[PDB]
Amino acid sequence: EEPDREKIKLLTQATSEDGTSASFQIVEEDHTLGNALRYVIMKNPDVEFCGYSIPHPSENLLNIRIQTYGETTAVDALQKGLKDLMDLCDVVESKFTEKIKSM
Amino acid sequence: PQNENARAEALNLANTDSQYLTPTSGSPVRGLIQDHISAGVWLTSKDSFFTREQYQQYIYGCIRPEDGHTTRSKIVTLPPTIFKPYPLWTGKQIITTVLLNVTPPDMPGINLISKNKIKNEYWGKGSLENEVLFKDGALLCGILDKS
Amino acid sequence: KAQSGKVPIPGVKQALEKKEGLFRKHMMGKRVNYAARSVISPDPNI
Amino acid sequence: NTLFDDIFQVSEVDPGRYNKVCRIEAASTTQDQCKLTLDINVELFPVAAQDSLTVTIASSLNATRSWRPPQAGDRSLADDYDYVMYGTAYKFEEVSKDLIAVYYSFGGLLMRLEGNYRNLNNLKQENAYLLIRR
């Protein structure tokens, strides 16, 4: 049994005890996913604040901060934005497969 | 330096934050130089409208509560200046927001009347974008420059 | 205050009086441990 | 709470070095004194010369916590009109006897009215919802 505990690190110094406002810290990520994830998280009707931020160009880090209104924590809203980004990549893959099979 | 009688004196006496005004005339010697000057003339301009997802990004692009930039442990924002056709924020309202978060919550906002370097006739007829106006910590008029 | 080929042997008095010597080179102007120098570079992300 | 309402006859639309913002000089149709200098986001709300707008300054829309983007079944006073702005008053200049002017700044887009009776209802409040129909 071996998970990976460096890839995502919730920063408790800026995380509300309510859970509805947290600041995550990914390693080895940048504008690639952090702008794709910020887009899909902001489509949740319960999200009040979302933004990604790279602290310095040197280290490969990524901070995204979700604040919700209520009845959904930011950890609960981080993972809805990861499934809908997983579901969106399957739509694009299912359309780009048809059109290659349409030539 | 190598002892706590010198760490305390590089943090309280010879640090850069106390060296803001020079002792020759009391003029400030620290500030933004070339391309930050020429971005505030675009950001605090009157064409600058930001949507909601763009508004939340520029605040957290500069202010990060994990590093300790906020004083409220949670980013507070403002209502937009345009409601009905589409909700939009103006570029002067981002400068209001970043002053709303870095200043302590107990003290009231800054009240300032000043001038720019940019004359009013470069903007057009009846423009007042030379008189800078802060009223309770809110940029209400005029762009920001080297001045 | 002695006689010298072209530049004679330094005496103990003349080991003391210029920018170099002793009293300004090694008493006001010592070299230090725990120091470093390098070329500087611009950064808006600090 | 409606504070001020009239109907204005727009006389000038000046773009003036801006691609999205026009300055609007409008004189009123009922009162023969009150004028209007306003900056509107002309990409959202296109205004021509010799138009007729219905300017309404409201105190709120109908003591909540903050703003929140709209959702299912909410109904507000902004649904009546076509263009809503929000901002503060910063300057009350008295021009002469009974020409007391007010100055609004909607996040940098300015407005100057000029009237006489409106001390009943134009305080220097942080809230001045400004609304335009037609």
Curated annotation (Swiss-Prot), chain A:
Its main location: nucleus. This is DNA-directed RNA polymerases I and III subunit RPAC2. Belongs to the archaeal Rpo11/eukaryotic RPB11/RPC19 RNA polymerase subunit family. One of its GO terms (molecular function) is DNA binding. GO terms for cellular component: nucleoplasm; nucleus; RNA polymerase I complex; RNA polymerase III complex. It comes from the Eukaryota. The keyword Ubl conjugation applies. DNA-dependent RNA polymerases catalyze the transcription of DNA into RNA using the four ribonucleoside triphosphates as substrates. Common core component of RNA polymerases I and III which synthesize ribosomal RNA precursors and small RNAs, such as 5S rRNA and tRNAs, respectively. There is a cross-link at K95 (Glycyl lysine isopeptide (Lys-Gly) (interchain with G-Cter in ubiquitin)). Keywords: DNA-directed RNA polymerase, Isopeptide bond, Nucleus, Phosphoprotein, Ribosome biogenesis, Transcription, Ubl conjugation. It is found in: Nucleus, Nucleolus. GO terms for biological process: nucleolar large rRNA transcription by RNA polymerase I; ribosome biogenesis; termination of RNA polymerase I transcription; termination of RNA polymerase III transcription; transcription by RNA polymerase I; transcription by RNA polymerase III; transcription elongation by RNA polymerase I; transcription initiation at RNA polymerase I promoter. Present with 8680 molecules/cell in log phase SD medium. The lineage of its organism: Eukaryota, Fungi, Dikarya, Ascomycota, Saccharomycotina. It comes from Saccharomyces cerevisiae (strain ATCC 204508 / S288c) (Baker's yeast). Component of the RNA polymerase I (Pol I) and RNA polymerase III (Pol III) complexes. Component of the RNA polymerase I (Pol I) complex consisting of 14 subunits: RPA135, RPA190, RPC40, RPA14, RPB5, RPO26, RPA43, RPB8, RPA12, RPB10, RPC19, RPC10, RPA49 and RPA34. The complex is composed of a horseshoe-shaped core containing ten subunits (RPA135, RPA190, RPB5, RPO26, RPB8, RPB10, RPC10, RPA12, RPC19 and RPC40) where RPA135 and RPA190 form the DNA-binding cleft.
Curated annotation (Swiss-Prot), chain B:
Signal peptide: none annotated. It comes from the Eukaryota. It is found in: Nucleus, Nucleolus. DNA-dependent RNA polymerases catalyze the transcription of DNA into RNA using the four ribonucleoside triphosphates as substrates. Component of RNA polymerase I (Pol I) which synthesizes ribosomal RNA precursors. Besides, RNA polymerase I has intrinsic RNA cleavage activity. RPA190 and RPA135 both contribute to the polymerase catalytic activity and together form the Pol I active center. In addition, subunit RPA12 contributes a catalytic zinc ribbon that is required for RNA cleavage by Pol I. Belongs to the RNA polymerase beta' chain family. Present with 2840 molecules/cell in log phase SD medium. Component of the RNA polymerase I (Pol I) complex consisting of 14 subunits: RPA135, RPA190, RPC40, RPA14, RPB5, RPO26, RPA43, RPB8, RPA12, RPB10, RPC19, RPC10, RPA49 and RPA34. The complex is composed of a horseshoe-shaped core containing ten subunits (RPA135, RPA190, RPB5, RPO26, RPB8, RPB10, RPC10, RPA12, RPC19 and RPC40) where RPA135 and RPA190 form the DNA-binding cleft. Outside of the core, RPA14 and RPA43 form the stalk that mediates interactions with transcription initiation factors and newly synthesized RNA. This is DNA-directed RNA polymerase I subunit RPA190. It comes from Saccharomyces cerevisiae (strain ATCC 204508 / S288c) (Baker's yeast). The chain holds residues 638 to 784 of 1664 of the full protein.
Swiss-Prot record, chain D:
Pfam families: RNA_pol_Rpb8. Transmembrane segments: none annotated. GO terms for molecular function: DNA binding; DNA-directed RNA polymerase activity. It is found in: Nucleus. One of its GO terms (cellular component) is RNA polymerase I complex. SUPFAM superfamilies: Nucleic acid-binding proteins. GO terms for biological process: nucleolar large rRNA transcription by RNA polymerase I; ribosome biogenesis; RNA-templated transcription; termination of RNA polymerase I transcription; termination of RNA polymerase III transcription; transcription by RNA polymerase I; transcription by RNA polymerase II; transcription by RNA polymerase III. Gene3D superfamilies: Nucleic acid-binding proteins. Residues 14-37 are annotated as: Non-specific ssDNA binding. Keywords: Acetylation, DNA-binding, DNA-directed RNA polymerase, Nucleus, Phosphoprotein, Ribosome biogenesis, Transcription. Present with 6210 molecules/cell in log phase SD medium. DNA-dependent RNA polymerases catalyze the transcription. of DNA into RNA using the four ribonucleoside triphosphates as substrates. Common component of RNA polymerases I, II and III which synthesize ribosomal RNA precursors, mRNA precursors and many functional non-coding RNAs, and small RNAs, such as 5S rRNA and tRNAs, respectively. Component of the RNA polymerase I (Pol I), RNA polymerase II (Pol II) and RNA polymerase III (Pol III) complexes. Component of the RNA polymerase I (Pol I) complex consisting of 14 subunits: RPA135, RPA190, RPC40, RPA14, RPB5, RPO26, RPA43, RPB8, RPA12, RPB10, RPC19, RPC10, RPA49 and RPA34. The complex is composed of a horseshoe-shaped core containing ten subunits (RPA135, RPA190, RPB5, RPO26, RPB8, RPB10, RPC10, RPA12, RPC19 and RPC40) where RPA135 and RPA190 form the DNA-binding cleft. Belongs to the eukaryotic RPB8 RNA polymerase subunit family. This is DNA-directed RNA polymerases I, II, and III subunit RPABC3. It comes from Saccharomyces cerevisiae (strain ATCC 204508 / S288c) (Baker's yeast).
